[PDB]
Design a protein around this ligand. Structure first.
Ligand code: CLA
Ligand code: CLA
Ligand code: CLA
Ligand code: CLA
Ligand SMILES: CCCCCC(=O)OC\C(C=C=C1C(C)(C)C[C@H](OC(C)=O)C[C@@]1(C)O)=C/C=C/C(C)=C/C=C/C=C(C)/C=C/C=C(\C)C(=O)C[C@@]12O[C@]1(C)C[C@@H](O)CC2(C)C
Ligand SMILES: CCCCCC(=O)OC\C(C=C=C1C(C)(C)C[C@H](OC(C)=O)C[C@@]1(C)O)=C/C=C/C(C)=C/C=C/C=C(C)/C=C/C=C(\C)C(=O)C[C@@]12O[C@]1(C)C[C@@H](O)CC2(C)C
Ligand SMILES: CC(=O)O[C@H]1CC(C)(C)C(=C=C/C(C)=C/C=C/C(C)=C/C=C/C=C(C)/C=C/C=C(\C)C(=O)C[C@@]23O[C@]2(C)C[C@@H](O)CC3(C)C)[C@](C)(O)C1
Ligand SMILES: CC(=O)O[C@H]1CC(C)(C)C(=C=C/C(C)=C/C=C/C(C)=C/C=C/C=C(C)/C=C/C=C(\C)C(=O)C[C@@]23O[C@]2(C)C[C@@H](O)CC3(C)C)[C@](C)(O)C1
Ligand SMILES: CC(=O)O[C@H]1CC(C)(C)C(=C=C/C(C)=C/C=C/C(C)=C/C=C/C=C(C)/C=C/C=C(\C)C(=O)C[C@@]23O[C@]2(C)C[C@@H](O)CC3(C)C)[C@](C)(O)C1
Ligand code: KC2
Ligand code: KC2
Lengths: 210, 168, 228, 218
């Protein structure tokens, strides 16, 4: 990332202990090194901000439909992933797998004027979805077509706020996920969750890799 | 004229590797001859490595190699790649050597090694001579690695303990 | 520049002793950065040590007498009179860790480059005034008052009065360092402090360890206490 | 260049010592070359020995302290005497260590980007950059061997030569230290102030894999 982290944070700003901004990243370049890191900055933020907010709803209430229901609620939601059926785990990952594959298509990205992020495009820009083989009513970002009329000042403030709330939540969920197993990790919480199974193992409760 | 060839490898910093200076005073019609010998060694070594891997993995044909005196392809394969070389009957060895020698005689009379430095005129997969020099260098490097590898296989099958990372 | 100012400050602290530097402390550059940085680092360390010494003397007097503020907080778990050394052994481990974190945050705010740059000051080792803590007008959340002057009761003092106050602070800090070290010695080894012998009790745990005797967890708070 | 050898050493330990070699390995010719090539070779040998010695000394301190890789195959062996840990390693592990080091120095010998070899005028102990010539390596790897994160990168040349002198001095001291530790493992009573440490050990330290020859008859 450039030295415009002063806008995101003064006092600090382009802290960068491990340099990482010129390691040339598969021989692509220095601009492409910056572009890949900025996307993985906020893609990890967007997952973590949704997962931490996702945590605070799962642990209290469950959707009353049927399949991901009636399993115990007074347990770790990391364990509640392991209680899902195998078809549910595959369909969750593959649904995100479509979103990853679709968003990286450079011919879709050039429909709206942008480019792939480390070829010069914006780091985080999900496509407006209107080029699929079959039409859908609702797209992903701004589904109700609500807040795309805002000026660039609100977008620039929001983009910086997305990063800063991103960095805060990546600490938030992972420190929380480090409290479920190895208890007593965070002495601020220390009153939630159990279970020593690996959260970084979606199919550990179903099969084994070898 | 040894500085031209193709064999200048970037693994030795893109210069000619002759520490014993064997090609210092060798002249044309011998430099082409030693290049032809190297190329034939390359090709025979690559074919030998593939055949050795096929025999060591076990593959073999199905049938009887010499119905007069037993010896199936499974019998040849089960003795090992090296010890299963004398299991072949002598007539089969002589017939293989005769066919290889007929090919050798035909190609030597058609393309002499002193005049044609390993070039027997097999089609050619590309024009644009820079790409062809790259493909020639790839052939040379693969053949040299196979030259080392087949002797490594023979040493590891005969003397155990040598070649520590030898499969089977 | 550094040596002349050091000699002037030494003369102002005491007109009789003047420059008293026995073990060449004004000449050894710490991180290979000339004598000015060494002099600034030594002055800042002396000022911080003296301030910590005066605050520690006040805290030792308060803890020895016993002047607990109210309820609910950390005084509800400490014993009703256990002298100063054991007051850092019965407090909660989370409480002591948070106090250490607050002290480190204050030190980092005092040492931050942009925190000094916003106030118009510089770093104390590259041509700055040692002990000049920056104000609190940049942390986005509105701070009610600054740390140096909370009620801003010294905004009209002269520079000569400021220099005299700094010299008095340095001298009182040296005296408080001597007194606090004497109290610590008399709390562990009898016969060190002759006047203070028999007042303070004996402490088993050495006073040079922060994590000596880990404190109890303790909830000590209600209304939404989901964190045990 | 038996003159720059003195300029390097006037900054080595002041003029307190200088060009000190009792048997005079300088002004030599060696394998049918010139004195400059021999001087460059000897400088590279000293630098490489020093680097290997500092790495080995740090590894000995870490291994004898008790810090050990949890993972899987290193958890199997449970000793302390670093040399015995190497001895009870699997043969494949030792061979892969040796061959990886051999690949690294094979790359170190290759000069496809920097014009001179360390004998033909290049800097001694200079590992060439991986990404300087990205079309002349078998497959791309980032994170170069020297300075993986480009921490030095832009630095003053005075700082570079000062670091080279510091590396040389630290290398010589680490050479002495690691040979002291090895002789502690072999010869008790030798190397005072270290007798209370290190374990007795046999098996010809300067030999991997099999054992049982040794300098038993001194
Ligand atoms: C049949 C073997 C053979 C032959 C005839 C050649 C022939 C040639 N090589 Mg070559 N090479 C070989 C195997 C061989 N190579 C192998 C296995 C490797 C990989 C290590 C290489 C790697 C190599 C490089 C990197 C280069 C050459 C080059 C050359 C050419 C010029 C050098 C020269 O005349 O000296 C070779 C002439 C000989 C007559 C050598 C015969 C073999 C000797 C007499 C026996 C050696 C025994 C050996 C040491 C025992 C251990 C080997 C094995 C068991 C492990 C020449 C056409 C150079 C070139 O073309 O540049 C333009 C060049 O740069 N070669
Ligand atoms: C009837 C069979 C026959 C005939 C006529 C030829 C004819 C020829 N071959 Mg050839 N070849 C054959 C079968 C045959 N090949 C078979 C079955 C193989 C194995 C697949 C080869 C592998 C082979 C290679 C790899 C090379 C030739 C070469 C040559 C040419 C020169 C040969 C030479 O100088 O003598 C041979 C001269 C020698 C000095 C013998 C080599 C001695 C080496 C150092 C030791 C090898 C062991 C030895 C050959 C085996 C004997 C038994 C052993 C226990 C001692 C010539 C066109 C060479 C060529 O064209 O280069 C220009 C060449 O490089 N051939
Ligand atoms: C140096 C080369 C070489 C040599 C000396 C041998 C020698 C042998 N092979 Mg063999 N083989 C080789 C390469 C070689 N192979 C390769 C490259 C393959 C992969 C296709 C195989 C696959 C293979 C099988 C599947 C079997 C053998 C078997 C055998 C044994 C019985 C003879 C036979 O039926 O041959 C058969 C050989 C072939 C079918 C390959 C001949 C080489 C091809 C045709 C390329 C020739 C190039 C051409 C003449 C010119 C092109 C320009 C004998 C020891 C048999 C056995 O009992 O051993 C387990 C057996 O069942 N080989
Ligand atoms: C001269 C260099 C050198 C050599 C030959 C060795 C050799 C060895 N080390 Mg070692 N080590 C070194 C330097 C070295 N170390 C340094 C500098 C460190 C500090 C980071 C360590 C830290 C270290 C640990 C923590 C462990 C070893 C272990 C081992 C042994 C198993 C191989 C292995 O997994 O290594 C791994 C070594 C590295 C990944 C360090 C790479 C070398 C640096 C980057 C240069 C083997 C005897 C293991 C052992 O004996 O316990 C069973 C083990 O657990 N090493
Ligand atoms: C860093 C990784 C290293 C991996 C190891 C390695 O590298 O193994 C190397 C190795 C063995 C080995 C080892 C050592 C080298 C000794 C090292 C290890 O010992 C230790 C402890 O270190 C052990 C071991 C076993 O590993 C062996 C290498 C073997 C090799 C390299 C084999 C190439 C075949 C090419 C062929 C057959 C081409 C056919 C091509 C053909 C047939 C054609 O083109 C047909 C053609 O019609 C086409 C298509 C177009 C036409 O116009 C032209 C013609 C008619 C010509
Ligand atoms: C034991 C020996 C003492 C040192 C003697 C010494 O070296 O001299 C002076 C010197 C340097 C010097 C010399 C000169 C004077 C320059 C010249 C001399 O030449 C002559 C002979 O003329 C030579 C020399 C070398 O002597 C350096 C001295 C430095 C010193 C002594 C600096 C103390 C800071 C105090 C602090 C930071 C307090 C913090 C506050 C603390 C620790 C606390 O709050 C403790 C406490 O919270 C705890 C933990 C729990 C609570 O419940 C209780 C309380 C609240 C109490
Ligand atoms: C005008 C316009 O356009 O519309 C506006 C408004 C509008 C609609 C909202 C917009 C939007 C989009 C959305 C959906 C925005 C929502 C974003 C979302 C959902 C953001 C989650 C953040 C989660 C965080 C920061 C977690 C921190 C987590 C923390 C700090 C921790 O857990 C740490 C901690 O746990 C430890 C480690 C130990 C504990 O003992 C103590 C605590 C708890 C402190 C726009 C479009 O962007 C802009
Ligand atoms: C008992 C205990 O500890 O409980 C713990 C268990 C556990 C699991 C530790 C916990 C956790 C969570 C953790 C630690 C989660 C961490 C997840 C993490 C960190 C996952 C990294 C993925 C890395 C990838 C995909 C790398 C790709 C890398 C690639 C593809 C490359 O290297 C390509 C490369 O191009 C570069 C980039 C540079 C180029 O020049 C060169 C090359 C070609 C080489 C808890 C919750 O704390 C609790
Ligand atoms: C440009 C710049 O700004 O620089 C930057 C960038 C740069 C250069 C890349 C950097 C670096 C790289 C590194 C990692 C540098 C560190 C190198 C390393 C690891 C250096 C180990 C030495 C080990 C020794 C000397 C062991 C001695 C051991 C000795 C002397 C002994 O045992 C002696 C002794 O045995 C006797 C003889 C007899 C016994 O009776 C007594 C004892 C036991 C005492 C830095 C550090 O980040 C700084
Ligand atoms: C679960 C996922 C998720 C979360 C939790 C989340 C939270 C926040 C927060 C709260 C801290 C803010 C303040 C914020 C702000 C902005 N977001 Mg998020 N956002 C998420 C996902 C996406 C996606 C997929 C896209 C996107 C975008 C934008 C744009 C720019 C729009 C514009 O400039 O047109 C702005 C200003 C779009 C994009 O950046 O395209 C340029 C885009 O496609 N966002 N976003
Ligand atoms: C075991 C590994 C190891 C250790 C323990 C170690 C210790 C030290 C110490 C502390 C004692 C210093 C102070 C120091 C300093 C320098 N090192 Mg070392 N170094 C090690 C490895 C390498 C390698 C592989 C290279 C290298 C180099 C340089 C350069 C030159 C930079 C430049 O000229 O830009 C400088 C200044 C490069 C080189 O010499 O290039 C001519 C190079 O390739 N170093 N190094």
């Amino acid at each position: 990332l450039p030295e415009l982290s002063k806008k995101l944070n003064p006092v600090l700003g382009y802290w960068d202990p491990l340099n990482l901004a010129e390691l040339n990243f598969w021989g692509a370049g220095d601009d492409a090194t910056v572009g890949f890191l900025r996307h993985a900055e906020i893609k990890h933020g967007r997952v973590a901000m949704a997962a931490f907010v996702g945590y605070c709803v799962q642990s209290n209430v469950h959707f009353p439909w049927a399949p991901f229901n009636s399993i115990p609620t007074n347990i770790a939601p990391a364990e509640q992933w392991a209680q899902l059926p195998e078809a549910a785990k595959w369909q969750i990952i593959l649904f995100v797998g479509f979103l990853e594959v679709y968003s990286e298509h450079s011919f879709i990205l050039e429909k709206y004027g942008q480019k792939h992020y480390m070829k010069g495009g914006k780091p985080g820009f999900f496509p407006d979805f209107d080029t699929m083989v079959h039409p859908v009513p609702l797209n992903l970002w701004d589904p109700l077509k609500a807040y795309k009329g805002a000026s660039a000042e609100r977008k620039a403030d929001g983009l910086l706020k997305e990063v800063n709330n991103g960095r805060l939540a990546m600490i938030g969920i992972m420190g929380f996920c480090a409290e479920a197993r190895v208890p007593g990790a965070v002495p601020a919480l220390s009153n939630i969750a159990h279970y020593a199974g690996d959260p970084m193992a979606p199919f550990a409760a179903n099969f084994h890799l070898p | 004229a040894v500085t031209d060839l193709v064999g200048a490898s970037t693994e030795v910093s893109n210069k000619v590797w002759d520490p014993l200076k064997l090609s210092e005073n060798m002249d044309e019609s011998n430099l082409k001859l030693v290049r032809a010998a190297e190329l034939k060694h390359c090709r025979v070594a690559m074919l030998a490595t593939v055949g050795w891997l096929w025999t060591a993995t076990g593959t073999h044909f199905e049938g009887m190699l010499s119905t007069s005196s037993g010896v199936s392809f499974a019998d040849v394969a089960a003795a090992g790649p090296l010890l299963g070389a004398a299991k072949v009957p002598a007539a089969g060895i002589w017939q293989m050597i005769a066919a290889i020698g007929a090919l050798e005689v035909y190609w030597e009379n058609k393309y002499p090694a002193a005049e044609c430095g390993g070039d027997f005129g097999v089609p050619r997969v590309t024009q644009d001579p820079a790409k062809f020099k790259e493909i020639q260098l790839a052939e040379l490097k693969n053949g040299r690695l196979a030259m080392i590898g087949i002797i490594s296989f023979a040493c590891a099958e005969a003397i155990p303990g040598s070649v520590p990372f030898y499969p089977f | 520049s550094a040596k002349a100012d050091l000699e002037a400050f030494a003369k102002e602290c005491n007109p009789v002793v003047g420059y008293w530097d026995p073990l060449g402390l004004a000449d050894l550059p710490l991180w290979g950065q000339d004598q000015d940085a060494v002099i600034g680092w030594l002055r800042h360390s002396e000022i911080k040590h003296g301030r910590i010494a005066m605050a520690g003397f006040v805290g030792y007097i308060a803890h020895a007498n016993g002047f607990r503020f109210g309820g609910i907080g950390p005084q509800n778990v400490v014993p009703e009179g256990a002298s100063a050394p054991e007051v850092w052994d019965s407090i909660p481990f989370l409480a002591k860790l948070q106090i250490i974190g607050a002290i480190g945050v204050l030190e980092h705010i005092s040492e931050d480059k942009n925190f000094l740059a916003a106030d118009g000051m510089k770093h104390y080792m590259r041509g700055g005034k040692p002990g000049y803590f920056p104000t609190f007008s940049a942390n986005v959340h509105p701070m009610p008052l600054n740390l140096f002057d909370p009620f801003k009761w010294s905004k009209n003092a002269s520079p000569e009065k400021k220099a005299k106050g700094l010299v008095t602070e340095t001298n009182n800090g040296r005296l408080a360092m001597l007194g606090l070290f004497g109290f610590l010695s008399e709390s562990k080894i009898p016969g060190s402090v002759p006047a203070l012998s028999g007042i303070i009790p004996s402490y088993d745990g050495d006073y040079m360890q922060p994590f000596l005797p880990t404190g109890p967890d303790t909830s000590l708070w209600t209304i939404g206490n989901l964190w045990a | 260049e038996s003159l720059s050898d003195l300029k390097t050493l006037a900054t080595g330990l002041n003029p307190v010592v200088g060009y000190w070699d009792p048997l005079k390995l300088g002004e030599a010719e060696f394998w049918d070359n010139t004195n400059e090539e021999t001087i460059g070779w000897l400088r590279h040998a000293e630098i490489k020995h020093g680097r290997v010695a500092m790495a080995g000394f740090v590894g000995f301190i870490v291994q004898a302290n008790g810090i050990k890789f949890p993972w899987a195959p290193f958890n199997a062996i449970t000793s302390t005497s670093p040399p015995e840990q190497w001895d009870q390693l699997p043969d494949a592990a030792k061979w892969q260590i040796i061959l990886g080091v051999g690949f690294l120095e094979w790359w170190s010998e290759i000069r496809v980007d920097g014009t001179p070899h360390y004998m033909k005028g290049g800097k001694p102990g200079y590992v060439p950059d991986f990404d300087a010539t990205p079309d002349q390596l078998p497959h791309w790897v980032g994170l170069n061997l020297y300075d993986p994160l480009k921490w030095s990168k832009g630095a003053s040349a005075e700082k570079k030569q000062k670091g080279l002198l510091t590396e040389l001095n630290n290398g010589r001291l680490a050479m002495l230290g690691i040979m002291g530790f090895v002789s502690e493992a072999k010869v008790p009573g030798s190397v005072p102030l270290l007798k209370g440490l290190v374990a007795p050990y046999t098996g010809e330290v300067m030999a991997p894999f099999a054992t049982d020859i040794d300098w038993s008859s001194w």
